[PDB]
Amino acid sequence: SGAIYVGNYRVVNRHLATHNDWANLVWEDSSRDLLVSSTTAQGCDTIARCDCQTGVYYCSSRRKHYPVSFSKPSLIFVEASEYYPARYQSHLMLAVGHSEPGDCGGILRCQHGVVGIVSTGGNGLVGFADVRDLLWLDE
Ligand SMILES: CSc1ccc(Br)cc1CC(=O)N1C[C@H](C(N)=O)CC[C@H]1C
Ligand SMILES: [Zn+2]
């Protein structure tokens, strides 16, 4: 679990969005596993606007942060799950690191701010949904 709170927006994994997220929907994209909902309170986070390929993510299944080198946002095949059919997930960045399904929502940050959230994984792999291209989050 986990979310980004920026301005009057809440960014979550689309497959973990609540009834309240859907009732206050701003934007969602199944191909990215993202959903953004509106909030009444002002957020605590800021978004990176950069091309960093290194950063640190929070791994809830280890209660620890880990440093990672990750690929640029790309279209990557993701196997079927209870949440989605087998498809290409877009704007996804992969890295070597530990992850389990419940780790989705953990934030990846670089020196500039929030880069994205955990969305996929594998055997010693962790994949992050990028949010740096969503310029409207800042206004
Ligand atoms: C951190 S998730 C994870 C971690 C390790 C392993 Br093995 C396997 C996973 C599962 C995984 O990749 N997905 C991706 C899915 C999606 N984004 O299409 C939504 C959550 C889940 C079902
Ligand atoms: Zn950066």
UniProtKB/Swiss-Prot annotation:
<feature type="active site" description="For protease 2A activity">
    <location>
        <position position="15"/>
    </location>
</feature>
<feature type="binding site">
    <location>
        <position position="110"/>
    </location>
    <ligand>
        <name>Zn(2+) 1</name>
    </ligand>
</feature>
<feature type="binding site">
    <location>
        <position position="50"/>
    </location>
    <ligand>
        <name>Zn(2+) 1</name>
    </ligand>
</feature>
<feature type="binding site">
    <location>
        <position position="112"/>
    </location>
    <ligand>
        <name>Zn(2+) 1</name>
    </ligand>
</feature>
<comment type="subunit">
    <text>Homodimer.</text>
</comment>
<feature type="active site" description="For protease 2A activity">
    <location>
        <position position="33"/>
    </location>
</feature>
<protein>
    <recommendedName>
        <fullName>Protease 2A</fullName>
    </recommendedName>
</protein>
<feature type="active site" description="For protease 2A activity">
    <location>
        <position position="104"/>
    </location>
</feature>
<comment type="function">
    <text>Cysteine protease that cleaves viral polyprotein and specific host proteins. It is responsible for the autocatalytic cleavage between the P1 and P2 regions, which is the first cleavage occurring in the polyprotein. Also cleaves the host translation initiation factor EIF4G1, in order to shut down the capped cellular mRNA translation. Inhibits the host nucleus-cytoplasm protein and RNA trafficking by cleaving host members of the nuclear pores. Counteracts stress granule formation probably by antagonizing its assembly or promoting its dissassembly.</text>
</comment>
<feature type="binding site">
    <location>
        <position position="52"/>
    </location>
    <ligand>
        <name>Zn(2+) 1</name>
    </ligand>
</feature>
